[PDB]
From a paper:
SLO is a pore-forming toxin belonging to the family of cholesterol-dependent cytolysins (CDCs) and can disrupt eukaryotic cell membranes with its cytolytic activity.
Analysis of the elution profiles of size exclusion chromatography (SEC) revealed the dynamic N-terminal region of SLO (residues 35-105) is dispensable for binding to the C-terminal enzymatic domain of NADase. The overall structure of the NADase193-451,G330D/SLO106-574 heterodimer exhibits an elongated shape with the C-terminal domain 4 of SLO bound to the C-terminal enzymatic domain of NADase. The buried surface area of the complex is ~863 Å2, which is at the smaller end of the range of buried surface area measures of typical protein complexes.
Residue numbers in the entry:
A (entry chain C): 103 to 168, 171 to 241, 250 to 298, 300 to 363, 365 to 366, 368 to 369, 380 to 384, 387 to 398, ...
B (entry chain B): 194 to 276, 278 to 280, 284 to 287, 290 to 293, 295, 297 to 322, 324 to 331, 333 to 364, ...
C (entry chain A): 194 to 366, 368 to 445
D (entry chain D): 104 to 167, 169 to 171, 173 to 244, 246 to 373, 378 to 395, 401 to 424, 426 to 571
The structure:
């Protein structure tokens, strides 16, 4: 019998949410402290953790040759598709036209493969590109790195490939020790496969719906048809520093002392061209050097599929959450007091020390110099240590004029004193005109 | 610490038989505090230098320090607190060995409140003296002008080698906040004058001072005697 | 003296490990001042009686002395100064059992009048947190996040007393190991900071959270419980008419 | 005949009449105007004033032995001023004497032809007895010469009463040591009652009293010199003397006033002084009586103004310088110390606090002493629990020394109101030093009350 009407009926009847059957829900974010601080020698290292969300639905799916993706291929819409490991559906197929967008080719761009297996379509792709070279002759993404799920969604590239080609230290990016950024350079041509008039038209008369179910077709894994493959070369760039400045990301160059270590990779066929420098212009000319289409050929890089039921484009929805880690390091300081005035002086020196509870909220320890309001004459001087976590530093020095209406006048009154290694607070002058200043060294 | 032990020991030897042990062990246990005060004033460079100077009983210091210390004496004048112990007895001096004194600006900031009112005779606790300021408190005031001319003559002295300590600083027990700078200032009237204090101070103009060699000399500037009034 | 010597040595045994030799010496040297104050309160008849009481650890007073001592508490109420941290633990820490005070053991208080006479200046402004820490003989910086106060008002105090719930501290309940007899706290050489001492019933704060209370305290200045539920010495919960207030002390 | 020699040579005598019979008292040496002495709960403040007396009596007292009589000749020397004069006994011309008993006419005057003591005494005895027999009935004026003084010293009371102090202490009993300490106050009064006086004409010339046999060398041998010129006894008074002593141990300020009033006959403030006073009356010959009833004294004085054959006695005489016929006086000059005393007693402030509030006290006082010059020395004192907060049932006892003064006591209580943090309950200056100063405070915070009461 002619199974065409059953295959069309059953595929038409398939029951699934398009969004949800290709949902790629990210790695579950485990409990975390928003802020933490650690004392080490004269240092205070503060790790700050911000929780963020990614939500993308790419319709171009990264290809990993580590194959079963090719124009007019049949795949299953399951979790394995969402992690660049699609399952194919291999049956006896029917004549299928493909088309390549190479510039000058006219009707010679279209070609009909009688039996469209991977081999036959690869052969036609091979012929077509060769002819163009003989007789006839880009998308860029950048993003900082926070976790494999985030960098995947941000660049639409599998994280294992990145991790294989460039070192990515996720565990220790989480400690704020490394600010890593990655750029992708994804081009030369696209082969496309005409969409069937009806779902059954891709199958031969011997293919039955029961056979399709045996190879995986269900409401939980609806059939997908590969309509377009993009070919070319990808150029991965990594920029890795151990700085802690907020300005690191603006790396984005795609002036600065920060410039640290670099890496660039050109995707070869097999699993490449790994180069690592401490100067960028070597890399940045490497990209242009790796930009020629010759018989340096072109490799699969991404592809587009439709649901066979209704030829709706298949998007993999990435709805996931990650952590931004920000690390800052403070250094203890010293308040240097020096009194060179001809009057009696008194100080009020106040600051807070800051720590974080296991819930990550800030705990303020108030703090005062034990000689506040003690009288001081010249040439008094002293050194007042401030810990690396000091904050809200208030320094006041005041003068006993002894006038019966202003017994004391403020000479110095700062309230937002910079914690620095040296806080030099000098006062001098006469009783009638005092002078004071705070400098930083 | 060989210096603390030598210090502690030499004070134990030289104190007066009749100072109570409450005084004497407070003195021993605040010594490190007063050593720190003298380092911060640059009277000495370290605690050992401070103790070594004490044990030697020769309080000699560097001119740079002493001239910086004097800036507040030149600016505001000097001040001696006395209670009675004030004159009519007999050598009409006020002792050629000099008069222990602090800067005028220091007494005025320490013995008055933040508004400018005189403290309760609290003042006894300040001078670490009980019941002696009950009559009231007197203050001998060398004015800033007298004071500057005293120093041009080179008549200002520092105490050298009981409760004396180096660093031109008065001892004041655990409350080091009442320790003031001490200097030695130079030295035909009766009582009678106290009338002029009830009427108004007692101001002498270009008074006749005494010198380290016992000579009288007549130095421009005011000198006042008064009951501290709030 | 015979009894003062026996007092001295009894102190050396029960004082805890972390009482400094300085404070302990201070406790020894001021001992007679605190005996005399107890005698002048007619808490005891003599130094001797006071030292025998400290040594015997049986803090037993004539009921007439305690009735007279309470007058100022009935008049003005009772006060317990606390840190913010200790306040939150009464509401938030479950092992604190949602009571203010050690449950059926009570809360150490002084008269409200005594704390207003002492923690404020002559003109009625709150003293600095340093001074108050010094007056209360607590660690430096303990009240730097503010000086909080529990307050039993006069009506609550009278009704608590009608029930016979007011207690006098005992030698084995009271500074931790610096307790002394005479319904009085020990305060160093500055005996003018010694206030009367009694034990009031704890307050139940079931279903209350420090968040709400501290929030109310910044808004109004105080959180209040009309007719609160006290903890009787036998552990019972019992509602007593009056006002119990929690507040942050303010000029 | 040496008349012209006696005249010329006596006239040549050169002396100062005032100084030759001057009697100088010992001059008070170093002494403190105020002393303060602390015994038990007592403070005794002795106060001293230095005073001067300058008298020149011309009636000189007679002691007892006296062999002084009208027309006697004596030496103006030291011993005269001490009532123990030196006679100059030579041979004498006839001397007229005159008694003043009333009614005798020309029989009041007689001429004694050998005017020795024995002869004049006999002539007077004859005058006096003849008056008793033939004139007393049918003619006597009472003549009483009265003096009173507080007793401060031997010399002072001698000047003040014109009576030799040895006779006063012998007959009465004067405790000068107790007077100096401020322990006894003593008054003495002397009733000199003159029944008659015998007078003796003044010689026209100095020699006239002397027999022609007398030589100036005989007079120099007998003591006559510029150092002791001759004296003629012109008058002697006879009668009786009654000494009255009023003694007490009170330090009251009115003892002299109470004493004068009793003597004066002045008829109850003084009853406290007089009931604790002792009285001594002596009538000289020694009829002595001690008693605590003052009428007994008044009775002695009234029962001894009687003149009969109880005769009269020489009690005082008047002399002139022979050279001059000028009345001889004896200048008494002396210093003495008036001593007062006051006793103060220690006290106690009893504080009791029964109020419903926190209270505080301010208790201040001064303690007085006296330096070695007798000037005040104020020690300010203050209660050491001043300004400490107190609650009921606080109470205490503050001892005050007997020398305390300027006691100021203030109690205040803490109202705790935004405008009234402290209210005064008691505010007292000059609190009375008493055995008990009972300072009570009580009431409520809003309505406090107190009082200081004394016991």
């Amino acid at each position: 019998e002619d199974h065409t009407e059953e295959i069309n009926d059953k595929i038409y009847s398939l029951n699934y949410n398009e969004l949800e059957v290709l949902a790629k829900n990210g790695e579950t974010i485990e409990n975390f402290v928003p802020k933490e601080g650690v004392k080490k020698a004269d240092k205070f290292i503060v790790i700050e953790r911000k929780k963020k969300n990614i939500n993308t639905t790419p319709v171009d799916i990264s290809i990993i040759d580590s194959d079963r993706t090719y124009p007019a291929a049949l795949q299953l819409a399951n979790k394995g598709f969402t992690e660049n490991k699609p399952d194919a559906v291999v049956t006896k197929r029917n004549p299928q036209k493909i088309h390549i967008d190479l510039p000058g080719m006219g009707d010679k761009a279209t070609v009909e493969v009688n039996d469209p297996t991977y081999a036959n379509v690869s052969t036609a792709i091979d012929n077509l590109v060769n002819q163009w070279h003989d007789n006839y002759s880009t998308q860029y993404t950048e993003s900082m790195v926070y976790s494999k799920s985030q960098i995947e969604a941000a660049l639409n590239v599998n994280s294992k490939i990145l991790d294989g080609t460039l070192g990515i230290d996720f565990k220790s990016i989480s400690k704020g020790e490394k600010k890593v950024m990655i750029a992708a350079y994804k081009i030369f041509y696209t082969v496309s496969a005409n969409l069937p008039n009806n779902p059954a038209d891709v199958f031969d008369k011997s293919v039955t719906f029961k056979e399709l179910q045996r190879k995986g077709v269900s409401n939980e894994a609806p059939p997908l048809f590969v309509s377009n493959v993009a070919y070319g070369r990808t150029v991965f760039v990594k920029l890795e520093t151990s700085s802690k400045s907020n300005d690191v990301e603006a790396f984005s160059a795609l002036y600065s002392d920060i410039l640290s270590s670099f890496t660039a990779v050109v995707l070869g066929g097999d699993a490449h061209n790994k180069v690592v420098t401490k100067d960028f212009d070597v890399i940045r000319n490497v990209i242009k050097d790796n930009a020629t289409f010759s018989r340096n050929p072109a490799y699969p890089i991404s592809y587009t599929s439709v649901f066979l039921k209704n030829n709706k484009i298949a998007g993999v929805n990435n709805r996931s959450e990650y952590v931004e880690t920000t690390s800052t390091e403070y250094t203890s300081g010293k308040i240097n007091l020096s009194h060179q005035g001809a009057y009696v002086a008194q100080y009020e020196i106040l600051w807070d020390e800051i720590n974080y509870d296991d819930k990550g909220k800030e705990v303020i320890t108030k703090r005062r110099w034990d000689n506040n309001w003690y009288s001081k004459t010249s040439p008094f001087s002293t050194v007042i240590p401030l810990g690396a976590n000091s904050r809200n530093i208030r320094i006041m020095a005041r003068e006993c004029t002894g006038l019966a209406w202003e017994w004391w006048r403020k000479v110095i009154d700062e309230r937002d004193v910079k914690l620095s290694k040296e806080i030099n607070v000098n006062i001098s002058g006469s009783t009638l005109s005092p002078y004071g200043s705070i400098t930083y060294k | 610490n060989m210096e603390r032990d030598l210090f502690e020991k030499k004070f134990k030897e030289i104190k007066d038989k009749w100072v109570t042990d409450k005084q004497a062990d407070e003195f021993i246990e605040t010594a490190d505090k007063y050593a720190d005060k003298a380092v911060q004033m640059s009277a000495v460079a370290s605690r050992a230098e401070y103790y070594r100077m004490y044990v030697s009983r020769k309080y000699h210091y560097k001119k740079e320090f002493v001239e910086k210390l004097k800036q507040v004496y030149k600016e505001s004048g000097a001040s001696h607190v006395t209670s009675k112990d004030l004159f009519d007895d007999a050598k009409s001096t006020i002792r050629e060995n000099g008069l222990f004194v602090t800067s005028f600006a220091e007494d005025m900031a320490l013995l008055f409140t933040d508004q400018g009112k005189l403290k309760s005779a609290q003042i006894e606790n300040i001078k670490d003296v009980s019941g002696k300021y009950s009559d009231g408190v007197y203050q001998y005031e060398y004015d800033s002008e007298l004071t500057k001319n005293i120093d041009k003559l080179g008549y200002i002295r520092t105490a050298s080698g009981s409760l004396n300590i180096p660093g031109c600083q008065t001892w004041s027990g655990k409350h080091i906040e009442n320790s003031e700078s001490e200097l030695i200032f130079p030295s035909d009237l009766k009582s009678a004058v106290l009338a002029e204090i009830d009427a108004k101070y007692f101001e002498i103009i270009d008074p006749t001072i005494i010198a380290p060699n016992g000579d009288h000399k007549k130095v421009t500037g005011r000198f006042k005697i008064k009951k501290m009034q709030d």
